[PDB]
A paper describes a structure:
This ring-shaped homotrimer encircles double-stranded DNA to act as a processivity factor for DNA polymerases and a landing pad for the assembly of various DNA processing factors such DNA ligase I, the flap endonuclease [name], and the clamp loader complex replication factor C (RF-C) which opens and closes the [name] ring around dsDNA. Many of the proteins that interact with [name], including DNA polymerase δ, DNA ligase I, [name] and RF-C, do so via a common mechanism that involves a short linear interaction motif on the partner protein called a [name]-interacting protein (PIP) motif. The best characterised PIP motifs have conserved sequence Qxxψxxθθ, where ψ and θ represent amino acids with hydrophobic and aromatic side chains, respectively, but other variations on this sequence (so-called non-canonical PIP motifs) have been identified such as ψxxxθ and Qxxψxθ.
[name] is a 5’ flap-specific nuclease that plays an important in Okazaki fragment maturation. Key catalytic residues in human [name] are conserved in the C. thermophilum enzyme, as is the PIP motif located towards the C-terminal end of the protein (sequence: 342 QARIEGFF 349 with conserved PIP motif residues underlined). As with Ct [name], the Ct [name] Q-pocket glutamine, Gln342, interacts with Ser208 and Ala252 in Ct [name], with the interaction with Ser208 involving water-mediated hydrogen bonding between Gln342 (OE1) and Ser208 (N), as is the case for the equivalent Gln441-Ser208 pairing in Ct [name], whereas the interaction with Ala252 involves a direct H-bond between Gln342 (NE2) and Ala252 (O), different from the water-mediated Gln441-Ala252 interaction in the Ct [name]-Ct [name] structure. A salt bridge links Glu346 (OE1) and His44 (ND1) also.
Numbering used by the authors:
A (entry chain P), B (entry chain P), C (entry chain P): 341 to 352
D (entry chain A), E (entry chain A), F (entry chain A): -1 to 255
Amino acid sequence: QQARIEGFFKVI
Amino acid sequence: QQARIEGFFKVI
Amino acid sequence: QQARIEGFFKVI
Amino acid sequence: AMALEARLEQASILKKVVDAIKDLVQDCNFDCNDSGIALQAMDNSHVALVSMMLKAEGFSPYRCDRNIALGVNLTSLTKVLRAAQNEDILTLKAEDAPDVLNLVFESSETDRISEYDLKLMDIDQEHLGIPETEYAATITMPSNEFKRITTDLMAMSESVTIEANKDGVKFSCQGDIGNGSVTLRQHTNVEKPNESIEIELSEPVSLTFSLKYLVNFCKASALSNTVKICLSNEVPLLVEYSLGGSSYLRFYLAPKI
Amino acid sequence: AMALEARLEQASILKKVVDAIKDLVQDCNFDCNDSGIALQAMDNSHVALVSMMLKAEGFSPYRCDRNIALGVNLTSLTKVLRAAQNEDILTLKAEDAPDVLNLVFESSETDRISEYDLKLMDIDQEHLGIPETEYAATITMPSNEFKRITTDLMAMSESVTIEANKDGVKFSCQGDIGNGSVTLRQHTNVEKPNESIEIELSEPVSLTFSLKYLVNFCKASALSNTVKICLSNEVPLLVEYSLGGSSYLRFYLAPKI
Amino acid sequence: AMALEARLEQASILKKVVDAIKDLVQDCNFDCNDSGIALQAMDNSHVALVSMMLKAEGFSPYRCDRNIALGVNLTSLTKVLRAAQNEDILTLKAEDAPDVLNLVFESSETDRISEYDLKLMDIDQEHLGIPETEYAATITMPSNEFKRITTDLMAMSESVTIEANKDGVKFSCQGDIGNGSVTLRQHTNVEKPNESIEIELSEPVSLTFSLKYLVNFCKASALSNTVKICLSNEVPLLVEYSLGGSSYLRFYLAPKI
Ligand code: NA
Ligand code: NA
Ligand code: NA
Ligand code: NA
Ligand code: NA
Ligand code: NA
């Protein structure tokens, strides 16, 4: 299954 | 609105 | 009407 | 010996003329006389007039013994003309009161001759008088530039306002995405005169038009390296492709009101 | 060491051969033996026979230890061959009674090697005997000319009559819009022999064919600069693209009756 | 004097940057500051991150008095940018807290100036931190090669596994029709360095990705003759198009898990 992108980066 | 062409020319 | 191809060739 | 016999050294010109009109005109008469082959037709939607003349001088040779109207469906004609290569010799022949137009295409590449007998149709269309007009403004500009301006503006709007004044000719649009304008100014290019912008201003003028039809007219872009656009209050826009000699393809477009 | 190993210096030829047949043939066997890689298949609609041979001599090198039938869906093969650049080195390998065809493409531009294992299928098709025929007429002509003639005529008709006699070879059609014909005559071009028209007439002949299938055959136009068309009463049309050496791609088309 | 005024000698670069992102991103902010014009946006489906910077140095000249976010629908922007020729001079202007982006295109061919006021939108998107990553493997390769590999593989599979080790970088797929792989190996081309393959291997790595998104990224192929692909366990794929100077367009793609 395809992972979403958000889980790889933190919010500034 | 868009005018028709006929009203600009006379019939020969 | 369109002829089929088979009738023009023999089976080996 | 048929009444009409008209030979083009190259089919290209006729292919290009029909290509420039077929999206606008379903059926029409080609009026053949001593002076050449002419066409006048309103577009399908009666917003524009197409006016064309291929003078006898453009043929090699041209013979028309008596006046002949050739009633033609342009889709049908296109299905035949497609067979002509640009570099083919092309001859049109027709008898008096003809049932068919005879087209012969001679390959310049191999010994191939194509011959078509295109069925004609009866077309009742009244001839319209195009009056002598002194335009408030005219602009001559590169053909492809006009094509791009109109095509690109049409992406953001259905309508374009064309204004001519001392500051040049401006095409402007307002649409959902915002506003756009394209301004052309009097300009001379010495080496490449087709890139010159020649503006003749008698009187400021501003009119609004349908871009769809302007874009359609630009299918004539291949016929001439320059286009002339003529504007006046109370008259249709004239978009003129003057060809070699005194041959022309002209489009007249009714304004929005 | 696999039973089949066949190397092309350039993938181009195989790409072009498959492109020329894939719109006609869904699935087929590639028959591999000492002499080369052959294919015989009826088109999907059983109106035409495709006959192809890539001789061993066209490879560099070619090895086939035992006869191998490679059953292939051509759409599937196309999805693999697309990956080969025209200038790639291409090698086909297959084991005895294979489950896959192994294709390796080597870039000539950078250090890239593509390798595919294409699943084969079981194809039961009987081999047809192509008899020795002395044709009433043959014409050799430029390939692209034949492509244009057939494609352009197809715009006005589904059928074309082909007549060969002392006055040349005429393709003629009759449709809604009128009649069309294209006549080719015996012709020699000294500088550009591919533009020559060579007609061998044993006996006048006239037959009618489906233009759709002729147009399909012209997907082979890139393989050969000339095409040979062979006509005889009571036999299919032969449209022949003779390739380098004794390799060929041939199409046989049943007439209308 | 507006807050932002940024001039490109040629519109081409901006046309190409937007063309490379518009199929992925519906709307986004262009963040303008002293350093240049930047963009960060997730793709519509939240599988990828687009990260772009056009440095001030790429403009001639560049002025940005205060930080400006320009919220733009890329379809709308495309309808305006289409009007710019590649060789037009292009200037972006915007006021503080702007309602429109002002775009002016100056023809280098004739005296034509296009001017657009593109309506902006309010875009609330949080800025994501892109961390410092030491990749297990990177490969620099010709851009168009990467485009073909991904596009051609996508014909047989939705997914591609990318493995980097001592034997090179392999792209492999398994689909209905069979298996495919493409292997790139460390390679130097002296005359044509863009055809070199430069592999930096810290640690073997293998990850699987959606080919659809890789193909989308390759819409950036025209921006740079080489592409750099960076792989590490636990991080997105980085596909990097480094431009002139320190400008870049980068795509980060989440793996399949
Ligand atoms: Na044509
Ligand atoms: Na000037
Ligand atoms: Na390809
Ligand atoms: Na001759
Ligand atoms: Na454009
Ligand atoms: Na090397």
